[PDB]
Amino acid sequence: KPAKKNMKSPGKAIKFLRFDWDKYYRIGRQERWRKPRGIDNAIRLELKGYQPKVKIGYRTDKQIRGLHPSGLRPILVKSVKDLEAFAKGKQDVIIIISSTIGLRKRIELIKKAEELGLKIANR
Amino acid sequence: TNIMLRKLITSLKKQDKAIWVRVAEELEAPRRKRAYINIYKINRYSKANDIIVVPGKVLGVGNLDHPVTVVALSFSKPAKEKILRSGGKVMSLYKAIQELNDFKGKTVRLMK
Amino acid sequence: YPILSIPEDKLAKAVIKNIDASVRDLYNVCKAIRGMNLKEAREFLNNVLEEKEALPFWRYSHGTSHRSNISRKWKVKSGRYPKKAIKYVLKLLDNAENNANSKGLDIDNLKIVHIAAHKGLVLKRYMTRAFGRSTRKYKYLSHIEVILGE
Amino acid sequence: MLKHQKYVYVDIGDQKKFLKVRFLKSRSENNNPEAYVILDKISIKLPRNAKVIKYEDLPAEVKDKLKLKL
Amino acid sequence: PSYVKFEVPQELADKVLEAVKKAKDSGKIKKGTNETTKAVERSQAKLVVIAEDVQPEEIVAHLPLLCEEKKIPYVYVPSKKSLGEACGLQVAAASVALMDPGEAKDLVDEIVKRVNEIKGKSS
RNA sequence: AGCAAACUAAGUACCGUGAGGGAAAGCUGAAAAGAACCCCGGAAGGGGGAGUGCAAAGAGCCUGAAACCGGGUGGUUAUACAGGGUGUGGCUCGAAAGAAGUGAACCCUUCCGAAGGAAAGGGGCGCAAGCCCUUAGUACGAGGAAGGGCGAUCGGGGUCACG
RNA sequence: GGGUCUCUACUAGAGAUCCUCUGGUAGGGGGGCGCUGUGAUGGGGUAGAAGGUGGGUCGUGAGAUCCACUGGACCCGUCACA
């Protein structure tokens, strides 16, 4: 539990955006990463003042990787039958209700999860 | 890719005899290079009531004089009836692990 | 219409669509009378019609030179008399005065609280140049909107 | 979506705070409490197409469910 | 509800909530268990309001014993989420203490008198 | 896209003296209920107020992106550069989806401490800058662990100044 | 990457532990993300869908998912295939 901000809070993350994302709007509006390959490219050569390349040394600690910022394990629930298959219990999961479920089924879906003691993100 | 070949390899490795660990290593060869043996070669290099362990398939070329017990992954159907007609026996690698004499067998030969 | 601040019953609106006036000339006309009283704006615009004073140009001011009739609104000595553009703005303000009469507002105390010009619709024609080449002869139309308040 | 008026924004005391509810425009009544399904969604602005009801115009037997919230 | 001693009628619970709302708006209020406990120790609090749905229970288990030994009234409420929102918070509050109701003095003492009947026959 | 051709006339319009070449273009609504009437205008499926409809991006009619232009919000500008990333500050936005009264943020105390690691004081050597023994592997030192105080904002977004 | 072990109707997953290695063009090799359709399915979702605009969170990343508004009838998770 106390090992969640020792790796995250001090190390503000890089964005890893494609080259020339700020000169052309056709490249800047995608907001995604693409590997540099030009023979003279400067992010490929890793020159000074040029926004790091993507590397495997940037991964996160395996014991906190992929967790909800509340410290639990997120589960995306699309039906009421997904609640009955709760593993272990309410101690280690946070429920993510699907966005497309209509308002009438949501009322019954939230009631079912509340009595089980589960924690809901988008309640 | 076979479900039963994979579960057989995982249980041979757990065995505590170097004979069975070598069979599991040999069964992991590329399919194009998997081992086999014909009846004529078992006859030449064995005596009566031996135990032959083949890490592949037993095929039916040649004839058999003496009775032997042969343990193999699979048998050709013409080859299976050649062995039984001469007074021998056939087992699968699955049953050979559990057999009580095959717990502490003696005079065992590994062939290919 | 933009504003969502003044109560609705104190406003008068109008729009004039697809007129033969450019946003280049109408940018400066709309900026000079923005925030004026209706009476001051209407009489200033009529002085530009017979060239008693010049209307200033801040943005699209190529081909316009300096006048003797500019000291009020600073950085520019450059002005002109955009006659065809003024005449459409006066027609728009006539429509907005009428709409305020129907609501029962006081005409003597009306203020121009919003005015802006927009791009309208283009008529696409072509010219005939030398050596068998062809170019554009477009006609750009525009909208103008105004809101009057107290 | 709010132009169909199946969702109604409640004006809680002229504040920069509007509460969104689901209004069952059926039930044919005039002062029933079941026409209002209370969501928990405090809007910070009022959308253009939203239909607004004043807090005092609600039935008195639903005002309690909201004034505790307020 | 092990720390909960005596059942309270629901017509009384909602009067507590609207008492806190007026106390928040015209008086001094302390929110949170870490601050209500210090309120009893310094004997600066006059009302202590305890939720009935805390989990785990040892956060507010010490309040009923530490409060009655100093002769200070206390009242229960069914839910903590409503108790937190009555105080002006966007989050639940487990316990609340009132410093001085201000213009809410006229009804807090009414709460004190009514709860005596329930706790008077508790022996 | 599918045949060149889903449509007011496809080998149709249109181009060539001719053999010949060869386009573009779909969508209101369940129902026209297709906006009566009144004020403005020369007129205009033109403006304003109305009315119809579950709903008017209402005839230039499904949804309605970007480039581009106009108006406004928040920062900022006439002694001085390119442009993004970082550090320290100013002003702003912060309902939800992020943390948080079961305690945000910030202050005090104690303890452990990797690689590394002093000086002041005392004594000795050198013309001198300085060096050697002791102080002392002490003070300290990345990180890490406990307690106390105060108590409601932080993470995040926009922009400006300076390195 | 390699050695040594555990569990699972296993073309793969989930783990424990010990040793060592970490620039890269041409090029060779291993794993994954995304788009449209088909056979299935514990399977589901919808007048509240797809799409659009702005913003949260997760992942080194390709990407995934949620929130508010817009919109008015269809669309997705998993396994295999093209």
Coordinates of C-alpha atoms (C1' of nucleotides) in Angstrom, one line a residue, chain D residues 1-4 6 9 20 41, chain G residues 47-48 67-72:
Chain D
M1 CA -30.3 14.5 -25.9
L2 CA -31.7 17.1 -23.6
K3 CA -33.8 18.5 -26.4
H4 CA -36.2 15.6 -25.9
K6 CA -36.7 13.4 -20.8
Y9 CA -32.2 20.3 -14.7
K20 CA -29.9 16.6 -13.3
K41 CA -24.9 14.8 -11.1
Chain G
rA47 C1' -34.1 4.4 -28.5
rG48 C1' -30.0 6.2 -23.6
rC67 C1' -16.9 11.4 -17.9
rA68 C1' -19.9 15.9 -19.7
rC69 C1' -22.2 17.8 -23.9
rU70 C1' -23.8 16.6 -29.1
rG71 C1' -26.4 12.9 -31.9
rG72 C1' -31.2 9.6 -33.4

